[PDB]
Each structure stands twice: as structure tokens, then as C-alpha cells.
From a paper:
Bromodomains (BDs) regulate gene expression by recognizing protein motifs containing acetyllysine. To begin to address this knowledge gap in an unbiased manner, we carried out mRNA display screens against a BD—the N-terminal BD of BRD3—using peptide libraries that contained either one or two acetyllysine residues.
The acetyl group of AcK6 forms the same hydrogen bond with the side chain of Asn116 that is common to all characterized BD–peptide interactions. Instead, Leu7 and Leu11 form contact with the WPF shelf of the AcK6-binding BD. These residues, together with Leu8, simultaneously interact with the WPF shelf of the second BD. The size of the interface made with each BD is also substantially greater than that observed for native partners with as many as nine residues from the peptide contacting both BDs in the crystal structure.
Residue numbers in the entry:
A (entry chain A), C (entry chain B): 32 to 147
B (entry chain C): 2 to 14
């Protein structure tokens, strides 16, 4: 299913470890529960749900083959938030602050993926 | 593909 | 209610002027035309479009009450690019380079805002 790579190690120990500690990360720790949270249109609008708790567990369980998958899961998580919510909603401003840090760290990741 | 949006070329290259 | 301030003068005659001359600025001169450029779901994801041509016109016509509002429009422009595109796309790297110059210029702006 997956393997160890230098870029996946970077995603786990730099990207996720930094974002998890961020003051705005907590709305993204768990899948959106449309029943508990009273979001009757969430799954009508969002067909590919993703959250940072799922990403973190995938890294810990060596689910990913390439860091490109992990980066896309982050992109999906953020994009879903912008599609579902209004641009003035606090959760969207929080997502944007997290995504800027994500992209800062991505710019500094090892540029060649090497299996470890 | 990384220059796709730039192309038209920038976005879709 | 628009206004003329020392900081808004700086946003027009330093920040916009500097960024416009940069070789990476041209994708940001005009609004993204999602139909012309074949950009799937652009307006589904980007609900608050912004571009530097619009910001320039706003400054030239005293649209803003405060430079803080203009700084917000720049942030919307950069973040929209970070949101819609994929983490390693060339246009994201261009936007990050422009944002670096933006932040350097903002750091040299007069710190207290005076109406002229």
C-alpha cells in the first residue's frame, strides 16, 4: 500500500507536526460529521471529504506511496472548505492561514523523492 | 503540467 | 467612504508600482477569465476574485478608506492563487515570490495612517 520516503517523512515530521500545533488547526482534526454538526447539504456539495486527522493517521500507518498523495489530500481538505463555506466565514480564514504555512513548508521540502 | 495555468500555458503546461 | 492617506499613497506609488514591474506579475494584471482559460470549477472554489488591475483602479479612484483594506485585497489575490492551484504549480511559486516583495514593501510603509 505504501512505503517510507524522505518526502513523506518531511510531511509527517515537519508539515503535519507544525500544522497540528497551530491555533487554527482544530476544525480539521476530524472528518466533518454532517449529522452531529447539522450540515444537511455537506455531502451533496463535497464528494471527496478529507481532514488532517486522516492525513496524520495515513502517514503513521504508511498508507501513502508518495508525498504527492499527501500533498493532494491537504489540497482536497482546504479546497472542500472553500467550496462549502462562505468566503467571510471564520473557518475559511483559518483554512487560509493553515494553507499558507502548508505551502511555505512544501516550498522547502526535499525536491527529489527517495525511498527509505 | 506544472506550468498549465501559466500557459493558458501557465495554468496547463 | 473612500479616503486619501499617507499609507494609501504608499500602496499606490510604492507597492503596486513595484509589483507591476516584476516579471512574474502579468498573470495578476486582470481578473481570471475561467471560461477563456479553461479553469474547471474556478468560481466554485474562488468566491471572492481579486487581481492587481482592480486594486490599482481602486487606489487610483480613492475607493479605500484605509490601506488595511487594500492590503486585504492583495491578500485575497495571493491566497486565491494559493487556493485554486496545486501546491507545486509554477503560478504558486510566482505568487509566493510576489508576496515576498509585497511584504518587504509593507514593512517599510509609514506605520501610522494620516489622512492627507
Amino acid at each position: 500500500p505504501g512505503r517510507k520516503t524522505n518526502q513523506l517523512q518531511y510531511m509527517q515530521n515537519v508539515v503535519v507536526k507544525t500544522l497540528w500545533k497551530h491555533q487554527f488547526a482544530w476544525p480539521f482534526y476530524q472528518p466533518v460529521d454532517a449529522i452531529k454538526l447539522n450540515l444537511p447539504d455537506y455531502h451533496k456539495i463535497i464528494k471527496n471529504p478529507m481532514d488532517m486527522g486522516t492525513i496524520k493517521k495515513r502517514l503513521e500507518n504508511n498508507y501513502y506511496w508518495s508525498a504527492s498523495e499527501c500533498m493532494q489530500d491537504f489540497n482536497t481538505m482546504f479546497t472542500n472548505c472553500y467550496i462549502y463555506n462562505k468566503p467571510t466565514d471564520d473557518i475559511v480564514l483559518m483554512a487560509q492561514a493553515l494553507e499558507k504555512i502548508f505551502l511555505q513548508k512544501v516550498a522547502q521540502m526535499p525536491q527529489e523523492e527517495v525511498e527509505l | 503540467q506544472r506550468s498549465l495555468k501559466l500557459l493558458k500555458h501557465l495554468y496547463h503546461g
